[PDB]
Amino acid sequence: VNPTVFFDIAVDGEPLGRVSFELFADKVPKTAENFRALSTGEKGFGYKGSCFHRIIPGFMCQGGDFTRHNGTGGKSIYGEKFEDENFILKHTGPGILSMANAGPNTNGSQFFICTAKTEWLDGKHVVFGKVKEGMNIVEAMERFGSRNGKTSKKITIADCGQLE
């Protein structure tokens, strides 16, 4: 039932590995659906080609900005931003896929992959998925981000899509 999507990560174009995720459509349908129709491209815009502009070691890896790529753009399948469907799932550990935002009800297309337990974001960020396999790719993926978050090299989503 639950949708499975993935990202083929590249470090400067040189492929590193794949990372698949499980979207919790059983908890956050609209939130999950958005990310699904964004990883496939079935609306003419998505993650394939975009990068991880903000990677903070021990914290998370952020991406989703396919328009401005500097943490300023990106959009959902319902236009610009969208509401905070709910706050039922928590940032319980590394692998968690949660929505990035600029305050409540501002969910667009940016998201982040947690590389640690980030419970302080609970109630402020909508969790909607989790790395199924490839967290090991996010290990090394995380060595390319400074304390402030600025990467050392270009971490790109070489390819992505839905498998089930």
């Binding site: 903000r54 914290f59 998370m60 952020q62 900005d65 943490g71 300023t72 990106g74 949660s98 990035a100 935002n101 600029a102 501002t106 667009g108 940016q110 982040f112 980030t118 302080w120 974001l121 960020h125």
Partner: peptide, 6 residues
């Protein structure tokens, strides 16, 4: 101005 913190 999108991003998690802390």
């Amino acid at each position: 101005h999108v991003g998690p913190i802390a």
